[PDB]
Amino acid sequence: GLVPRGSHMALLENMHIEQLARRLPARVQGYPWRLAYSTLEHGTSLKTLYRKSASLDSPVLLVIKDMDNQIFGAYATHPFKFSDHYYGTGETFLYTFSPHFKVFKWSGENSYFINGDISSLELGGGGGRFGLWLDADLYHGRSNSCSTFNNDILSKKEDFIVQDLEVWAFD
């Protein structure tokens, strides 16, 4: 029940982080998670997130801490990359620890799982709505309810600012 070595998300160990590990697919259950990208350690930009993810042979966990110290993110079946079309598959889900742990799994309504653009990263879709959105600097973020996951707003408000962001891998 510990965050990866070198992670700065140690606040999760007091939020019962095993709630998230239990929601991982049995595919990756039992595999230790490791820190693949950290904004504090490796710099903050969407480009660096893509570059740090290019060598991952594993699904990933996106862990975001906003300026209200609320922690949330996503489990992606595919490492985050630039593409000209949506990717990711049915095991992709969103999660939040605010105000308590909640998971938002695939609803089967659409397959708008992940969209990695040059200037934004994006999860969830349907009617032009985004479940989770991050700008090119991984600074301004947004979270709405989307049909892909039937999620709640992951943080206190729709808009948030990234205080710290990490990507964990299992390979």
Coordinates of N, CA, C and O in Angstrom, one line a residue:
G1 N 0.8 -1.2 0.0 CA 0.0 0.0 0.0 C 0.8 1.3 0.0 O 0.6 2.2 0.8
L2 N 1.9 1.3 -0.9 CA 2.8 2.4 -1.0 C 2.8 2.9 -2.4 O 2.6 2.2 -3.3
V3 N 3.1 4.2 -2.5 CA 3.3 4.8 -3.9 C 4.6 4.3 -4.4 O 5.4 3.8 -3.6
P4 N 4.9 4.5 -5.7 CA 6.2 4.0 -6.3 C 7.3 4.8 -5.6 O 7.2 5.9 -5.1
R5 N 8.5 4.1 -5.6 CA 9.7 4.7 -5.1 C 10.0 6.0 -5.9 O 9.9 6.0 -7.1
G6 N 10.3 7.1 -5.2 CA 10.6 8.4 -5.8 C 9.3 9.2 -6.1 O 9.5 10.4 -6.5
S7 N 8.1 8.7 -5.9 CA 6.9 9.4 -6.1 C 6.8 10.5 -5.0 O 7.2 10.3 -3.9
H8 N 6.1 11.6 -5.4 CA 5.8 12.7 -4.4 C 4.3 12.7 -4.0 O 3.9 13.7 -3.4
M9 N 3.6 11.6 -4.4 CA 2.2 11.5 -4.0 C 2.0 10.7 -2.7 O 1.0 10.0 -2.6
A10 N 2.9 10.9 -1.8 CA 2.8 10.1 -0.5 C 1.5 10.4 0.3 O 1.2 9.7 1.2
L11 N 0.8 11.5 -0.1 CA -0.5 11.8 0.6 C -1.5 10.7 0.3 O -2.5 10.6 1.1
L12 N -1.3 9.9 -0.7 CA -2.2 8.8 -1.0 C -2.2 7.7 0.0 O -3.2 7.0 0.2
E13 N -1.1 7.5 0.7 CA -1.0 6.4 1.7 C -1.9 6.7 2.9 O -2.1 5.7 3.7
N14 N -2.3 7.9 3.1 CA -3.3 8.2 4.1 C -4.7 8.3 3.6 O -5.7 8.4 4.3
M15 N -4.9 8.1 2.3 CA -6.2 8.1 1.6 C -6.6 6.7 1.2 O -7.5 6.5 0.4
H16 N -5.9 5.7 1.7 CA -6.2 4.3 1.5 C -6.1 4.0 0.0 O -7.0 3.7 -0.8
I17 N -4.8 4.1 -0.5 CA -4.5 3.9 -1.9 C -4.8 2.6 -2.5 O -5.0 2.4 -3.7
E18 N -5.0 1.6 -1.6 CA -5.4 0.2 -2.1 C -6.7 0.2 -2.8 O -7.0 -0.7 -3.6
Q19 N -7.6 1.2 -2.5 CA -8.8 1.3 -3.2 C -8.6 1.4 -4.7 O -9.4 0.9 -5.5
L20 N -7.5 2.1 -5.1 CA -7.2 2.2 -6.6 C -6.6 0.9 -7.1 O -6.9 0.5 -8.2
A21 N -5.6 0.3 -6.4 CA -5.0 -0.9 -6.8 C -6.0 -2.0 -7.0 O -5.9 -2.9 -7.9
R22 N -7.1 -2.1 -6.2 CA -8.1 -3.1 -6.3 C -8.9 -2.9 -7.6 O -9.5 -3.9 -8.0
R23 N -8.9 -1.7 -8.1 CA -9.7 -1.5 -9.3 C -8.9 -1.7 -10.6 O -9.5 -1.7 -11.7
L24 N -7.6 -1.9 -10.5 CA -6.8 -2.3 -11.7 C -7.3 -3.6 -12.2 O -7.7 -4.5 -11.5
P25 N -7.2 -3.8 -13.6 CA -7.5 -5.1 -14.1 C -6.6 -6.2 -13.6 O -5.5 -6.0 -13.2
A26 N -7.1 -7.4 -13.5 CA -6.3 -8.6 -13.1 C -5.1 -8.7 -13.9 O -4.1 -9.4 -13.5
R27 N -5.1 -8.2 -15.1 CA -3.9 -8.2 -16.0 C -2.7 -7.7 -15.3 O -1.6 -8.3 -15.3
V28 N -2.8 -6.5 -14.6 CA -1.7 -5.8 -14.0 C -1.7 -6.0 -12.4 O -0.8 -5.4 -11.8
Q29 N -2.7 -6.6 -11.9 CA -2.7 -6.8 -10.4 C -1.6 -7.7 -10.0 O -1.3 -8.7 -10.6
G30 N -1.0 -7.3 -8.9 CA 0.2 -8.0 -8.4 C 1.5 -7.5 -9.0 O 2.6 -7.7 -8.4
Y31 N 1.5 -6.7 -10.1 CA 2.6 -6.1 -10.6 C 2.9 -4.8 -9.8 O 2.0 -4.0 -9.5
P32 N 4.2 -4.6 -9.4 CA 4.5 -3.3 -8.7 C 4.4 -2.1 -9.7 O 4.8 -2.3 -10.8
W33 N 3.9 -1.0 -9.2 CA 3.9 0.2 -10.0 C 5.2 1.0 -9.8 O 5.7 1.0 -8.6
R34 N 5.7 1.6 -10.8 CA 6.9 2.4 -10.7 C 6.7 3.8 -11.4 O 5.8 3.9 -12.2
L35 N 7.5 4.7 -10.9 CA 7.4 6.1 -11.4 C 8.1 6.2 -12.8 O 9.3 6.0 -12.9
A36 N 7.3 6.5 -13.8 CA 7.7 6.7 -15.2 C 7.9 8.1 -15.6 O 8.7 8.5 -16.5
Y37 N 7.2 9.1 -15.0 CA 7.3 10.5 -15.3 C 6.8 11.3 -14.0 O 5.8 10.9 -13.5
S38 N 7.5 12.3 -13.7 CA 7.2 13.2 -12.6 C 7.5 14.6 -13.0 O 8.6 14.9 -13.4
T39 N 6.5 15.5 -12.9 CA 6.6 16.9 -13.2 C 7.7 17.5 -12.4 O 8.5 18.3 -12.9
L40 N 7.8 17.2 -11.1 CA 8.8 17.8 -10.2 C 10.2 17.3 -10.6 O 11.2 18.1 -10.4
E41 N 10.3 16.1 -11.1 CA 11.6 15.5 -11.3 C 12.1 15.8 -12.8 O 13.3 16.0 -13.0
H42 N 11.2 15.7 -13.7 CA 11.5 15.6 -15.1 C 11.1 16.9 -15.9 O 11.3 16.9 -17.1
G43 N 10.5 17.8 -15.2 CA 9.9 19.0 -15.9 C 8.5 18.8 -16.3 O 7.9 17.7 -16.2
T44 N 7.8 19.9 -16.6 CA 6.4 20.0 -16.8 C 6.0 20.4 -18.2 O 6.2 21.6 -18.6
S45 N 5.6 19.5 -19.1 CA 5.0 19.8 -20.4 C 4.4 18.5 -21.0 O 4.8 17.4 -20.6
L46 N 3.4 18.7 -21.9 CA 2.8 17.6 -22.5 C 3.9 16.9 -23.4 O 3.8 15.6 -23.5
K47 N 4.8 17.6 -24.0 CA 5.8 17.0 -24.9 C 6.7 16.0 -24.0 O 6.9 14.9 -24.5
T48 N 7.1 16.5 -22.9 CA 7.9 15.6 -22.0 C 7.1 14.4 -21.6 O 7.7 13.3 -21.5
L49 N 5.8 14.6 -21.3 CA 5.0 13.4 -20.9 C 5.0 12.4 -22.0 O 5.1 11.2 -21.8
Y50 N 4.8 12.9 -23.3 CA 4.9 12.0 -24.4 C 6.2 11.3 -24.5 O 6.3 10.1 -24.7
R51 N 7.3 12.0 -24.4 CA 8.7 11.5 -24.5 C 9.0 10.5 -23.4 O 9.5 9.4 -23.7
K52 N 8.6 10.8 -22.2 CA 8.8 9.8 -21.1 C 8.0 8.6 -21.2 O 8.3 7.6 -20.6
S53 N 6.9 8.7 -22.0 CA 6.0 7.5 -22.2 C 6.3 6.7 -23.4 O 5.7 5.6 -23.5
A54 N 7.2 7.1 -24.2 CA 7.4 6.5 -25.5 C 8.1 5.1 -25.4 O 7.9 4.3 -26.3
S55 N 8.7 4.8 -24.3 CA 9.4 3.5 -24.1 C 8.7 2.6 -23.1 O 9.2 1.6 -22.7
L56 N 7.4 3.0 -22.7 CA 6.7 2.2 -21.8 C 6.0 1.0 -22.5 O 5.3 1.2 -23.5
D57 N 6.2 -0.2 -22.0 CA 5.5 -1.4 -22.5 C 4.5 -1.9 -21.5 O 4.6 -3.0 -21.1
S58 N 3.5 -1.1 -21.2 CA 2.7 -1.3 -20.0 C 1.5 -0.3 -20.1 O 1.6 0.8 -20.7
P59 N 0.4 -0.7 -19.5 CA -0.6 0.4 -19.2 C -0.1 1.3 -18.1 O 0.9 1.0 -17.4
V60 N -0.8 2.4 -18.0 CA -0.3 3.5 -17.1 C -1.4 4.0 -16.2 O -2.6 3.9 -16.5
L61 N -0.9 4.6 -15.1 CA -1.8 5.4 -14.2 C -1.4 6.8 -14.3 O -0.2 7.2 -14.1
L62 N -2.4 7.7 -14.5 CA -2.2 9.1 -14.4 C -2.6 9.6 -13.0 O -3.8 9.3 -12.7
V63 N -1.7 10.2 -12.3 CA -2.0 10.7 -11.0 C -1.8 12.2 -10.9 O -0.7 12.7 -11.1
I64 N -2.9 13.0 -10.7 CA -2.9 14.4 -10.7 C -3.2 14.9 -9.3 O -4.2 14.5 -8.7
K65 N -2.4 15.9 -8.8 CA -2.7 16.6 -7.6 C -2.9 18.1 -8.0 O -2.0 18.7 -8.5
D66 N -4.1 18.6 -7.7 CA -4.4 20.0 -8.0 C -3.9 20.9 -6.9 O -3.4 20.5 -5.9
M67 N -4.2 22.2 -7.0 CA -3.8 23.2 -6.0 C -4.6 23.1 -4.7 O -4.3 23.8 -3.8
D68 N -5.7 22.3 -4.7 CA -6.5 22.1 -3.5 C -6.0 20.8 -2.8 O -6.7 20.3 -1.9
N69 N -4.9 20.2 -3.3 CA -4.4 18.9 -2.7 C -5.3 17.8 -3.0 O -5.2 16.7 -2.3
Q70 N -6.3 17.9 -3.9 CA -7.1 16.8 -4.3 C -6.4 15.9 -5.4 O -5.8 16.5 -6.3
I71 N -6.5 14.6 -5.3 CA -5.8 13.7 -6.1 C -6.8 12.9 -7.0 O -7.8 12.4 -6.4
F72 N -6.5 12.8 -8.2 CA -7.4 12.1 -9.2 C -6.6 11.8 -10.5 O -5.4 12.2 -10.6
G73 N -7.2 11.2 -11.4 CA -6.6 10.8 -12.6 C -7.3 9.8 -13.5 O -8.5 9.7 -13.6
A74 N -6.5 8.9 -14.0 CA -7.0 7.9 -15.0 C -6.1 6.7 -15.0 O -4.9 6.8 -14.7
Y75 N -6.7 5.6 -15.4 CA -5.9 4.4 -15.8 C -6.1 4.2 -17.3 O -7.3 4.1 -17.8
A76 N -5.0 4.2 -18.0 CA -5.0 4.1 -19.5 C -4.5 2.8 -19.9 O -3.4 2.4 -19.5
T77 N -5.2 2.1 -20.8 CA -4.8 0.8 -21.3 C -3.5 1.0 -22.2 O -2.9 0.0 -22.5
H78 N -3.2 2.2 -22.7 CA -2.1 2.5 -23.6 C -1.3 3.7 -23.0 O -1.9 4.6 -22.5
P79 N 0.0 3.6 -23.1 CA 0.8 4.8 -22.7 C 0.4 6.0 -23.6 O 0.0 5.9 -24.7
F80 N 0.5 7.2 -22.9 CA 0.0 8.4 -23.6 C 1.0 8.8 -24.7 O 2.2 8.8 -24.6
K81 N 0.4 9.1 -25.9 CA 1.2 9.4 -27.1 C 0.4 10.4 -27.9 O -0.8 10.6 -27.7
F82 N 1.1 11.1 -28.8 CA 0.4 11.9 -29.8 C -0.2 11.0 -30.9 O 0.4 10.0 -31.3
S83 N -1.4 11.3 -31.3 CA -2.0 10.6 -32.4 C -3.0 11.6 -33.1 O -3.4 12.6 -32.6
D84 N -3.5 11.2 -34.3 CA -4.5 11.9 -35.0 C -5.9 11.3 -34.9 O -6.8 11.6 -35.7
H85 N -6.1 10.4 -33.9 CA -7.4 9.7 -33.7 C -7.4 9.2 -32.3 O -6.4 9.1 -31.6
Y86 N -8.6 8.9 -31.8 CA -8.8 8.3 -30.5 C -8.1 6.9 -30.4 O -8.1 6.2 -31.3
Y87 N -7.6 6.6 -29.2 CA -7.1 5.3 -28.9 C -7.4 5.0 -27.4 O -8.2 5.7 -26.8
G88 N -6.8 3.8 -27.0 CA -7.3 3.3 -25.7 C -8.5 2.3 -25.9 O -9.2 2.4 -26.8
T89 N -8.6 1.4 -24.9 CA -9.7 0.4 -25.0 C -10.5 0.3 -23.7 O -10.3 1.1 -22.8
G90 N -11.3 -0.7 -23.6 CA -12.4 -0.7 -22.6 C -12.0 -0.8 -21.2 O -12.8 -0.4 -20.3
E91 N -10.8 -1.2 -20.9 CA -10.3 -1.2 -19.5 C -9.9 0.2 -19.0 O -9.6 0.3 -17.8
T92 N -9.9 1.2 -19.8 CA -9.6 2.5 -19.4 C -10.6 3.1 -18.5 O -11.8 2.9 -18.7
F93 N -10.2 3.8 -17.4 CA -11.2 4.4 -16.5 C -10.6 5.6 -15.9 O -9.4 5.8 -15.9
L94 N -11.5 6.5 -15.4 CA -11.2 7.6 -14.6 C -11.4 7.3 -13.1 O -12.1 6.4 -12.7
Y95 N -10.7 8.0 -12.2 CA -10.9 7.9 -10.8 C -10.6 9.2 -10.1 O -10.0 10.1 -10.7
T96 N -11.1 9.3 -8.9 CA -10.8 10.4 -8.0 C -10.8 10.0 -6.6 O -11.4 9.0 -6.2
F97 N -10.0 10.7 -5.7 CA -10.0 10.5 -4.3 C -10.7 11.6 -3.6 O -10.8 11.6 -2.3
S98 N -11.4 12.5 -4.3 CA -12.0 13.7 -3.7 C -13.5 13.6 -4.0 O -13.9 13.6 -5.2
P99 N -14.4 13.7 -3.0 CA -14.1 13.7 -1.6 C -13.7 12.4 -1.0 O -13.3 12.3 0.2
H100 N -13.9 11.3 -1.8 CA -13.5 10.0 -1.4 C -13.3 9.2 -2.7 O -13.6 9.7 -3.8
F101 N -12.7 8.0 -2.6 CA -12.4 7.3 -3.8 C -13.6 6.9 -4.6 O -14.6 6.4 -4.0
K102 N -13.6 7.2 -5.9 CA -14.6 6.8 -6.8 C -13.9 6.4 -8.1 O -12.9 7.0 -8.5
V103 N -14.5 5.4 -8.7 CA -14.0 4.9 -10.0 C -15.1 5.0 -11.0 O -16.3 4.9 -10.7
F104 N -14.7 5.3 -12.3 CA -15.6 5.6 -13.4 C -15.2 4.8 -14.6 O -14.3 5.2 -15.3
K105 N -15.7 3.6 -14.7 CA -15.3 2.6 -15.7 C -16.1 2.8 -17.0 O -17.0 3.6 -17.1
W106 N -15.7 2.1 -18.1 CA -16.3 2.2 -19.4 C -17.8 1.9 -19.3 O -18.2 0.9 -18.8
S107 N -18.6 2.8 -19.9 CA -20.0 2.7 -20.0 C -20.5 2.0 -21.3 O -21.6 1.6 -21.4
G108 N -19.6 1.7 -22.2 CA -20.0 1.1 -23.5 C -20.7 2.1 -24.4 O -21.2 1.6 -25.5
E109 N -20.9 3.3 -24.0 CA -21.7 4.2 -24.9 C -20.9 4.8 -26.0 O -21.5 5.0 -27.1
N110 N -19.6 5.0 -25.9 CA -18.7 5.3 -27.0 C -17.3 4.9 -26.6 O -17.0 4.5 -25.5
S111 N -16.4 5.0 -27.6 CA -15.0 4.5 -27.4 C -14.0 5.7 -27.5 O -12.9 5.6 -27.9
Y112 N -14.5 6.9 -27.0 CA -13.6 8.1 -27.0 C -12.7 8.1 -25.8 O -12.8 9.0 -24.9
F113 N -11.9 7.1 -25.7 CA -11.1 6.9 -24.5 C -10.0 7.9 -24.3 O -10.0 8.7 -23.4
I114 N -9.0 7.9 -25.3 CA -7.8 8.8 -25.1 C -7.6 9.5 -26.4 O -7.7 8.9 -27.5
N115 N -7.3 10.8 -26.4 CA -7.0 11.6 -27.5 C -5.8 12.5 -27.2 O -5.9 13.4 -26.5
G116 N -4.6 12.1 -27.7 CA -3.4 12.8 -27.5 C -3.1 13.8 -28.7 O -2.7 13.3 -29.7
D117 N -3.3 15.1 -28.5 CA -3.1 16.1 -29.5 C -1.8 16.8 -29.2 O -1.1 16.5 -28.2
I118 N -1.4 17.7 -30.1 CA -0.1 18.4 -30.0 C -0.2 19.3 -28.8 O 0.8 19.6 -28.2
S119 N -1.4 19.9 -28.5 CA -1.5 20.9 -27.5 C -2.4 20.6 -26.3 O -2.6 21.4 -25.5
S120 N -2.9 19.3 -26.3 CA -3.7 18.9 -25.1 C -3.8 17.4 -25.0 O -3.6 16.7 -26.0
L121 N -4.0 16.9 -23.8 CA -4.2 15.5 -23.6 C -5.7 15.4 -23.0 O -6.1 16.3 -22.3
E122 N -6.3 14.3 -23.4 CA -7.8 14.3 -23.3 C -8.3 12.9 -23.1 O -7.8 11.9 -23.8
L123 N -9.2 12.7 -22.1 CA -9.8 11.4 -21.9 C -11.3 11.6 -21.8 O -11.8 12.5 -21.2
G124 N -12.0 10.7 -22.5 CA -13.5 10.7 -22.5 C -14.0 11.6 -23.6 O -13.4 12.6 -24.0
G125 N -15.2 11.3 -24.0 CA -15.8 12.0 -25.1 C -17.3 11.8 -25.2 O -17.9 11.2 -24.2
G126 N -17.9 12.3 -26.2 CA -19.4 12.2 -26.4 C -20.0 13.6 -26.4 O -19.9 14.3 -25.4
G127 N -20.6 14.0 -27.5 CA -21.2 15.3 -27.6 C -20.2 16.5 -27.4 O -20.6 17.6 -27.0
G128 N -18.9 16.2 -27.7 CA -17.9 17.3 -27.5 C -17.6 17.5 -26.1 O -16.9 18.5 -25.8
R129 N -17.9 16.7 -25.2 CA -17.6 16.8 -23.7 C -16.4 16.0 -23.4 O -16.2 14.9 -24.0
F130 N -15.5 16.5 -22.5 CA -14.3 15.8 -22.2 C -14.4 15.4 -20.7 O -14.8 16.2 -19.8
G131 N -14.0 14.1 -20.4 CA -13.9 13.7 -19.1 C -12.8 14.3 -18.3 O -12.9 14.7 -17.1
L132 N -11.6 14.4 -18.9 CA -10.4 14.9 -18.3 C -9.6 15.6 -19.4 O -9.3 15.0 -20.4
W133 N -9.1 16.8 -19.1 CA -8.4 17.6 -20.1 C -7.2 18.3 -19.5 O -7.4 18.8 -18.4
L134 N -6.1 18.4 -20.2 CA -4.9 19.0 -19.7 C -4.3 19.8 -20.9 O -4.2 19.3 -22.0
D135 N -3.8 21.0 -20.6 CA -3.2 21.8 -21.6 C -1.8 21.4 -21.9 O -1.2 20.5 -21.4
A136 N -1.1 22.1 -22.9 CA 0.2 21.7 -23.4 C 1.3 21.9 -22.3 O 2.3 21.2 -22.4
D137 N 1.0 22.7 -21.3 CA 2.0 22.9 -20.2 C 1.7 22.1 -19.0 O 2.4 22.2 -17.9
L138 N 0.6 21.2 -19.0 CA 0.2 20.4 -17.9 C 0.0 21.4 -16.7 O 0.3 21.0 -15.5
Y139 N -0.7 22.5 -16.9 CA -0.9 23.5 -15.9 C -2.4 23.7 -15.7 O -3.0 23.3 -14.7
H140 N -3.1 24.3 -16.7 CA -4.6 24.3 -16.6 C -5.2 23.0 -17.0 O -4.7 22.3 -17.9
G141 N -6.2 22.6 -16.2 CA -6.9 21.3 -16.4 C -8.4 21.5 -16.3 O -8.9 22.6 -15.9
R142 N -9.1 20.5 -16.8 CA -10.6 20.6 -16.8 C -11.1 19.2 -16.7 O -10.5 18.2 -17.1
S143 N -12.2 19.1 -16.0 CA -12.9 17.8 -15.8 C -14.4 18.0 -15.9 O -14.9 18.8 -15.1
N144 N -15.1 17.3 -16.8 CA -16.5 17.3 -16.9 C -17.0 15.9 -16.9 O -16.3 14.9 -17.1
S145 N -18.4 15.7 -16.8 CA -19.0 14.5 -16.9 C -19.1 14.2 -18.4 O -19.7 15.0 -19.2
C146 N -18.7 13.0 -18.8 CA -18.7 12.6 -20.2 C -19.4 11.2 -20.3 O -19.4 10.4 -19.3
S147 N -19.9 10.9 -21.5 CA -20.6 9.6 -21.7 C -19.7 8.4 -21.7 O -20.2 7.3 -21.5
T148 N -18.4 8.6 -22.0 CA -17.5 7.5 -22.1 C -17.4 6.8 -20.7 O -17.3 5.6 -20.7
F149 N -17.4 7.6 -19.6 CA -17.2 7.0 -18.3 C -18.3 7.3 -17.3 O -18.3 6.7 -16.2
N150 N -19.3 8.1 -17.7 CA -20.3 8.6 -16.8 C -19.8 9.0 -15.4 O -20.2 8.7 -14.4
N151 N -18.7 9.9 -15.5 CA -17.9 10.3 -14.4 C -18.5 11.5 -13.7 O -19.3 12.2 -14.3
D152 N -18.1 11.7 -12.5 CA -18.3 13.0 -11.8 C -17.2 13.9 -12.2 O -16.1 13.5 -12.7
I153 N -17.4 15.2 -11.9 CA -16.2 16.1 -11.9 C -15.2 15.6 -10.9 O -15.5 15.4 -9.7
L154 N -14.0 15.4 -11.4 CA -13.0 14.7 -10.6 C -12.5 15.5 -9.4 O -12.1 14.9 -8.4
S155 N -12.5 16.8 -9.5 CA -12.0 17.7 -8.5 C -13.1 18.5 -7.9 O -14.3 18.2 -8.1
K156 N -12.8 19.6 -7.1 CA -13.8 20.4 -6.5 C -14.6 21.2 -7.5 O -15.9 21.3 -7.4
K157 N -14.0 21.7 -8.5 CA -14.6 22.5 -9.6 C -14.2 21.9 -10.9 O -13.3 21.1 -11.0
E158 N -14.9 22.4 -12.0 CA -14.6 21.9 -13.3 C -13.2 22.2 -13.7 O -12.5 21.4 -14.3
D159 N -12.8 23.5 -13.5 CA -11.4 23.8 -13.8 C -10.5 23.6 -12.6 O -10.9 23.8 -11.5
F160 N -9.3 23.2 -12.9 CA -8.3 23.0 -11.8 C -6.9 23.4 -12.4 O -6.7 23.6 -13.6
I161 N -5.9 23.5 -11.5 CA -4.5 23.8 -11.8 C -3.7 22.7 -11.3 O -3.8 22.3 -10.1
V162 N -2.8 22.1 -12.1 CA -2.0 21.0 -11.7 C -0.9 21.5 -10.7 O 0.0 22.3 -11.1
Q163 N -0.9 21.0 -9.5 CA 0.2 21.2 -8.6 C 1.3 20.2 -8.8 O 2.5 20.5 -8.7
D164 N 1.0 18.9 -9.1 CA 2.0 17.9 -9.3 C 1.3 16.8 -10.1 O 0.1 16.5 -9.9
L165 N 2.0 16.2 -11.1 CA 1.4 15.2 -12.0 C 2.5 14.1 -12.1 O 3.7 14.3 -12.2
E166 N 2.0 12.8 -12.2 CA 2.9 11.7 -12.3 C 2.2 10.7 -13.2 O 1.0 10.6 -13.4
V167 N 3.1 9.9 -13.9 CA 2.6 8.7 -14.6 C 3.3 7.5 -14.0 O 4.6 7.5 -13.9
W168 N 2.6 6.5 -13.6 CA 3.1 5.2 -13.1 C 2.9 4.1 -14.1 O 1.9 4.1 -14.9
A169 N 3.9 3.2 -14.2 CA 3.8 2.1 -15.1 C 4.1 0.8 -14.3 O 4.5 0.8 -13.2
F170 N 3.8 -0.3 -15.0 CA 3.9 -1.6 -14.4 C 5.0 -2.5 -15.0 O 5.1 -3.7 -14.6
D171 N 5.8 -2.0 -15.9 CA 6.8 -2.9 -16.6 C 8.2 -2.7 -16.0 O 8.3 -2.0 -14.9

